[PDB]
Amino acid sequence: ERLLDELTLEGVARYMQSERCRRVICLVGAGISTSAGIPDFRSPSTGLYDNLEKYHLPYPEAIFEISYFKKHPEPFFALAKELYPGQFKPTICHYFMRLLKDKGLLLRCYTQNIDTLERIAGLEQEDLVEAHGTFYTSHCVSASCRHEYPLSWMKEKIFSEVTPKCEDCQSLVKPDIVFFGESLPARFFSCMQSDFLKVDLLLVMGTSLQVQPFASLISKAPLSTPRLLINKEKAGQSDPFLGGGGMDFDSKKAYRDVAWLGECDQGCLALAELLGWKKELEDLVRREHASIDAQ
Numbered sequence: 001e002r003l004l005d006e007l008t009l010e011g012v013a014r015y016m017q018s019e020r021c022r023r024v025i026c027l028v029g030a031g032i033s034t035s036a037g038i039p040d041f042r043s044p045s046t047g048l049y050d051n052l053e054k055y056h057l058p059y060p061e062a063i064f065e066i067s068y069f070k071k072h073p074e075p076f077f078a079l080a081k082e083l084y085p086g087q088f089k090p091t092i093c094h095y096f097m098r099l100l101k102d103k104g105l106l107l108r109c110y111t112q113n114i115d116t117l118e119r120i121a122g123l124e125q126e127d128l129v130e131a132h133g134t135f136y137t138s139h140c141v142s143a144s145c146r147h148e149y150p151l152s153w154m155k156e157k158i159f160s161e162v163t164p165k166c167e168d169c170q171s172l173v174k175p176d177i178v179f180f181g182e183s184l185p186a187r188f189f190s191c192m193q194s195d196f197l198k199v200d201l202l203l204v205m206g207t208s209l210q211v212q213p214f215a216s217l218i219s220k221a222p223l224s225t226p227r228l229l230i231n232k233e234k235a236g237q238s239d240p241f242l243g244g245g246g247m248d249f250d251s252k253k254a255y256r257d258v259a260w261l262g263e264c265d266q267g268c269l270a271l272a273e274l275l276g277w278k279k280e281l282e283d284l285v286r287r288e289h290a291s292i293d294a295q
């Protein structure tokens, strides 16, 4: 009747080491980076849209709006300096998906985060769908130029409080995050159309599944595909206030969805431990953290 022998983390681990679990898709959000020191810029405890009074924005979201940025880029870049992370050290959760890659299990990681930590942890561009873009690369905004700049160039401009301009054409250079007024990357839709024909397990980590169209990804899985949520709070259930592919963890009809409630790092650690990967994961994290700490 069902691919999981029980609706628990133990059931997921046994399935993961069975011949049927070949291809894993990860869907990740801000909750996998809060333990790296990166705030969830959508939680209120952060208060992003505060102290923006001096910029005289026609509305708070203008600082992330493409049309405003191209006319007045100085507020966005002042904010980017104010909130620039002190370090880019990926979490146990990020290195868990590097292990998935190493073991040939990672089909794709779809991320809502812009903080580059998936790449630092060793996921390659082919492994990634950065649904909201990334700060890792930046581009000249002129359509006839589009010169690409790395984060180290963009960092120097941001901290020196020099508005970044293209060396070839002197247009603005923008970090590759999807501003309001921009479309999600086409790669998001083309990869979704192919990847979800092939997926054996959906690993949903550190996302409340409230932002669309990212949240709708869970409904693209085949009906048999198990879905494991590792998150501080249960998420993804159908919303009774809207009257369908949502998460069913707890009903007598539940058959494939599992919720592990806690910190993402601790959940990934628990899953790795069940899989026999705990020493591999600790060795990788300790080595990569030491290398980053020594930069």
Ligand SMILES: Cc1c(F)cccc1CN1CCC[C@@H](Cc2nc(-c3ccc(NC(=O)c4ccc(Cl)cc4)cc3)no2)C1
Residues within 6 Å of the ligand: 038, 041, 048, 064, 079, 080, 083, 084, 085, 114, 115, 116, 132, 135, 177, 178, 179, 180, 181, 182, 183, 184
């Ligand atoms: C962290 C970091 C980092 F890693 C590396 C360097 C610096 C920073 C600091 N960092 C620099 C960016 C601004 C701020 C974090 C932040 N970015 C946002 C944000 C960005 C994009 C969107 N776009 C959408 O949601 C969207 C758009 C179009 C469509 Cl169709 C659908 C959705 C919304 C909010 N909010 O806060 C501080």
Ligand SMILES: [Zn+2]
Residues within 6 Å of the ligand: 140, 141, 142, 145, 146, 147, 166, 167, 168, 169, 170, 171
């Ligand atoms: Zn240019």
